[PDB]
Amino acid sequence: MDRRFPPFSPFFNHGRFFDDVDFDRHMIRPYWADQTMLTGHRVGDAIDVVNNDQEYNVSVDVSQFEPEELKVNIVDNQLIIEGKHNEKTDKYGQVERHFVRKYNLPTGVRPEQIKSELSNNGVLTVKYEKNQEQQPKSIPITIVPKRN
Amino acid sequence: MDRRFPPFSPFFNHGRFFDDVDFDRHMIRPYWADQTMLTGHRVGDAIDVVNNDQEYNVSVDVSQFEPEELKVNIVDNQLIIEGKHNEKTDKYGQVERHFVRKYNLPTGVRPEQIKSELSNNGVLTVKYEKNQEQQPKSIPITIVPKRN
Amino acid sequence: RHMIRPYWADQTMLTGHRVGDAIDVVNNDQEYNVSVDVSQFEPEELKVNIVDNQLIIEGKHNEKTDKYGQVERHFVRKYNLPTGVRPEQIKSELSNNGVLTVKYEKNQEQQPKSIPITIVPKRN
Amino acid sequence: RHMIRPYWADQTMLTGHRVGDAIDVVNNDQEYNVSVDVSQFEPEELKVNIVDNQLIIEGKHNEKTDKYGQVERHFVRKYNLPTGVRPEQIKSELSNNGVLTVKYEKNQEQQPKSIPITIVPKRN
Amino acid sequence: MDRRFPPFSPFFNHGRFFDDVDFDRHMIRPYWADQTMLTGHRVGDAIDVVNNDQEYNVSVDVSQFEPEELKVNIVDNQLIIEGKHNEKTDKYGQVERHFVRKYNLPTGVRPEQIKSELSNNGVLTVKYEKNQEQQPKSIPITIVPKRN
Amino acid sequence: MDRRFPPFSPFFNHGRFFDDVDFDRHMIRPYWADQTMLTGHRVGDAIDVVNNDQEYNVSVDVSQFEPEELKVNIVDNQLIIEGKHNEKTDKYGQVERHFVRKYNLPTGVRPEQIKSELSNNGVLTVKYEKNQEQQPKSIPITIVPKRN
Amino acid sequence: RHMIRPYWADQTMLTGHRVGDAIDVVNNDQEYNVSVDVSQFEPEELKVNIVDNQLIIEGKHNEKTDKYGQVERHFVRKYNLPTGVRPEQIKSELSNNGVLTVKYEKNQEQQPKSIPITIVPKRN
Amino acid sequence: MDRRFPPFSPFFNHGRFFDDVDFDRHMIRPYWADQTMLTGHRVGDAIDVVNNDQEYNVSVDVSQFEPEELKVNIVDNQLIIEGKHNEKTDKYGQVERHFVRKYNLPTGVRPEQIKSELSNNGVLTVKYEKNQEQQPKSIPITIVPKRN
Amino acid sequence: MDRRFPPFSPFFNHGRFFDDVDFDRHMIRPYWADQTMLTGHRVGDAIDVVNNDQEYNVSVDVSQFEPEELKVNIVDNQLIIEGKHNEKTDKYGQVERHFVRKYNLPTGVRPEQIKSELSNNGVLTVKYEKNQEQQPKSIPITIVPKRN
C-alpha cells in the first residue's frame, strides 16, 4: 500500500474490481526495505501539542511503526503512546526500534470524546475539544472492514 | 456478498473451504450498480424509536451506506448518526448522498451498555435497556475477524 | 417537498425515498433527456447548475425538526454532458409528480440544403 | 441511368453493376470526401439527405418494364458523419461518369492570429 | 466458405475430419468486407432466359445475397425472385441492397417439377423441361444437413 | 437462444464473428428449466382465426414446443396442427405434454400459397390470402442454413 | 537567445540545453496551457503556427559562427489540439526566463440560464 | 539497454545466458519517454576540442540521438557531424530535433587513422594523433556483432 | 520484412514495442517463394548511369539478391558490382543466379566520398559528386544496429 499504482484502492486502474484491493497495513512496505531514511520524512515525531481553551490536538508521526505496532494507554494521569516493533530485515541489515512516550493531561479533559486518527503518510493525531458541548453518550455501530 | 450463491459463506456449495469466503463489506454490491431503487427496500430510514420504561430500541435502515461509511457520535446530549459516502458510479451515472441525523436522549440512559447491531439487509438497530439491571463493568475479549 | 417536516412518530417519512433517485436518461443524436425524481425536496430547494461543461444536480433542504429528532436531506448528483451539448439553452422540465426532466434536443432540425441532382452542386 | 429499361434479351443489363458501389472516402482534418458510383440511376432518381447529423445516400428508380420481365433497383446507403461535419454546407459533386462525389473541406483555412513573438501576446 | 484452403470441406488438408467443416452459408464472407466490387463478378444478374419447346432454364446471379436472404414466390402468373439483406458493415462503410424481380410465365409450364439450383460462385439457375415426360408425382426423402 | 446477450446473433458483443452463433432451436432453453409458467406467456394457444373475404390468418402460440416438435398436416379437409414432445426434466420434475388440433377449412382456399411463420417469442402464424391474385406457380431456391 | 554565438572555447555553450524542452501541459475542461522552454532561441527566431487544427511549435536560428566551428539549432515540435480548441483566439505568453506558455481557457465562463425552479422552465 | 538490471549484458543476473542479451541500440530508451530533460545530462554537446602538437581529440555528447541517427561526413575541409531523428512520441507529447555541425580541420591531419568512439552515456569522441608515427596502412578483420 | 503489416517496424500496430522488430535482411522473403517473377519488378537491373560535370549517379536494381549477397569491389579502374547467391528452393523448384558487372570510371572521380544506398524496393544507387567541393577527410562514428 502507498507504494505504486496497483495499491491504494480504489485508485487502481488495472481492473478496479478485485485484483489488488487490500488493507492499509502495507503502508510501511516502501520503508520496510528502506533504512537510510528518517521517521517517515517529517521533522520529529510529535508534530505539535495544542493546549488552549477551545481545543486539544496533538499530532504524532508514527510512519516508522505499523498501526498494529502502535498502542495507546493512559497510566496515572499521563497520555502514553508506546510503539514496539520486532527486528526488521531490510536490504541493509537488521534494525529494532522502540519508543515510549508520556504526556501530562490538562484538568477537565474528558476522554470519552477524544478521537485519534492516522493519516496516509503515517501521522497519528489525537484531537480533543474543550468543555463547551458534547455529552458522554456514545452510540457505536458495526463497521465492516475493507478487505477486497 | 448477499448477491449470489458463492458469496455468503459458509453457505457456499462450490468448495465450502477457501474459495469465496470474504467479509460482509460487499453487502452494497448489488445496489452499487442499482440506481432506480429505494433505501435498500424498507419504508423510510429510521424504522422505529422505542422509548418506554423497559427498553430503548431504535432501528435505522442503513442499506444505502457501507458499514465503513457509517459512524455514530454523541454531541451535546444528542444521538447523532451520520453517514457520508463518496460519489459512486453505476450503470446509470454518478450519485453522491449524505445524511445527518440527530436524536434527543432520555434522562437516565447509560451509554456504557448500549449495543448497536447491523442486520444482513442493512438495518442498524440501537438497543438500550432501562435502569433495572447491569453495571458499568465491561470486560472485552479479542475477536479474530473472518477473512477467508 | 414539505413532507420531510412531519417526522414525529413517522420516522419512516410519509413516502420512503432516498436522495438521488432518477428514472431514465436518453442519449442519442436527436435528444438528450435526464429525468430525476426530486419528490423529497421543495421547488425552491432544488438547484441545477452547469459548471465546466458538466451538469450538476443538487438537492438540499433545511433540517426539518420534529418531536424527537430533526432530519435533513442533502445530495449532489453529477451528470457528464456529452459532446455537442450547449449549456446556454439546455431544456428543463419539472413534472407535478416530483420528477425533474432535463432535456436537450440538440437543435438539429435544420433542412439539408445539399441536394445533389444533376451536375456540380458544389456549396452555396 | 436510362440503360435499365432495355432489359429485353439483355437480362445482364448493358453494363454489369450492383446497387451501392462507391470508390473511396478520404477522412482527415483537412477534407471529407465521399465518392459513390451512381451510374445505374437517373440524375432525377438520386436523392441524398442528412438526418440526425448522418449522411444518407439512396438510389431508387421505377421498375423498368421490357419484353419478358420488369426490373427495379433500390438501395439505401448510410455513411456516418464524423465530428465537426456541418450538414448545412456539405459539398457535393456528380461527375459525368456516373460517380457522385460528396465533399467537405471543413472550412479550416483561417489564418492563425496567435503569433507569439516578444512578450505577453495574450488574446485579442 | 470459398475464401481459403481450410474452408470448402472435404478439401481441407489441415485434419480432414472435424476441424473446419461448416455449411455453405459463409460463401459471401469474402464479399462481406469487399465493397468496391460487382455482383459477385458476372455480367449482370439474370444470366439468360431460355424459353423454347424443349426446356425453360433461367440463370440468376445471386452472389451478392446469402441463400437465407433469397426467397422465390409466384404472384399472379409471375415468377418473382426477391432478395433483401440488412445493412452490412464492411471495411469501407455500410450498404443496404434490395432487388425485386418479376418474370412472365409461358403457358403449359408445370411448377411441380421445376428445379432450382445454386452454384458455388453464387448463381441461382431455375430449370424447367417442357411437356414431354415426367408426372406430377413426387416422393421426397429425408436429407441430413452437413454441419461438421 | 433468446436467453441472454451472447445468444441471438448477430446481436453478440463478445466477438461478433464465430463464438456464439447458433440456430434458433434453443428458443425453449429458458423454459426448459422453467415449469411454474404458462404457454410461453400469451393468453391461450390459438391467438386468432381470421376468416374474411380478403385474408385467412391464424396465429398459434407454440412457445412450449420446439420447432422440431411441431408438425402440420391436413387430414380430410381439416387443418391439423399437432405437436408432441418427450418428457422433459427441469428443476422441478418431469413433464410430458401433447396437443392435437383440428380446424375446418373454408371453400376456395388454395393451399399452394399458404405461408406459415414462427415468431421469436414462439407464435406460429398461418396466413392465407383470398382468391384475388397469385397463381399456383412456385419457384424455390436453395437456402443455406445459418449454423455459425 | 544570443548566447549561441559565443561558441569559441565554449563548445558546451553558456547553458547546456537541448532543442525541444518544455515544462508542463495542463489539459482539462477549464483550460489548455502549453509551457515550452525556448531559452536557446531569440524572440524573433521563434515561430508558432496552427495548421489543420493542430499546434506547431518550431524554433530555428541562423548558424552562429565562431573561432572553430559554427553551430545551429533547428527543431519542430508538434502538439495535437484537443476537441473544442479554437485556433483563432489561442492564448500565448512568453515569460522572461525563456519559457513560452501557450494557453487556452476554452471561454466557458458563461452563466447557465437553465435554472429549473417550479414548473416547465423549458428553453428561452 | 542502460535502463535496469536485466539489460546491459553480461551484467544480467536473471539467467546470464540467453534471456535479455541485446544490442546497445536501446541506450536512448530511458530518454525515449523522458522529455523534461537535457542533452542526456552533460553541459553542452561538444565537450572539448583539443588541438595541440601531440593529439587532436574532440568529444561530442550524442546522448539525445541513437547511433543509427548519427552520421559523420567531411565536406570541403570541414568536420561535419549531423544527426537527424524522426519525431518521437513520449509521455509528454511529440518532439523532433535536428542538429548540424561543422568544424575546421588543421593542416597535416591524416584522416586514415582517426578513430571515433561512443561511450555508454552517449558521448562520441573523435581522437587523432599528430604526425609522429603510424602509417596509412590499415588491415581490417571480420567482427561478429553481439546479438544475443 | 516488406511482406505484411507486422514486419516493417516501427509501422507495427500489434504491440509497437518488441514483438516483430527485425533487420531488413528479410526483404527478399516475398520473392523467396516467388519464382514466376522479374528482377524485383523494375525494367532492367542498372536503372541509369549519370555521367556529367556535376554528378555521377548510377542506380542498380538488386532486389533479387540479399544485401549480404551483394558486394562491390574495384579492379583495374573498373566499378565492379558482383552478387552471387546459393541455390534457393521455392514453391516451384530450385534456382541459382549469378551476375558480374564491370563499369568504366571517369577520370578525376574521387572514391573517398562516393556513397552507395539501398532502397526499400531493392535498388542500390551509387552516387558521386564532381570535383567542386568536399575534402578526403572522413570522420566515422559508431552506429548501433537496429535488432529489436
Author numbering:
A (entry chain A), B (entry chain A), E (entry chain A), F (entry chain A), H (entry chain A), I (entry chain A): 1 to 148
C (entry chain B), D (entry chain B), G (entry chain B): 1 to 124
What are the paper's exact sentences on this?
The oligomer has a cubic shape with the symmetry of a regular tetrahedron. The edges of the cube are represented by ACD dimers resulting in a 24-mer structure. We were able to generate a pseudo-atomic model of the Hsp17 24-mer consisting of residues 25 to 148 for the surface monomer and residues 1 to 148 for the inward-facing monomer.
Caenorhabditis elegans encodes 16 different sHsps, among them Hsp17, which is evolutionarily distinct from other sHsps in the nematode.
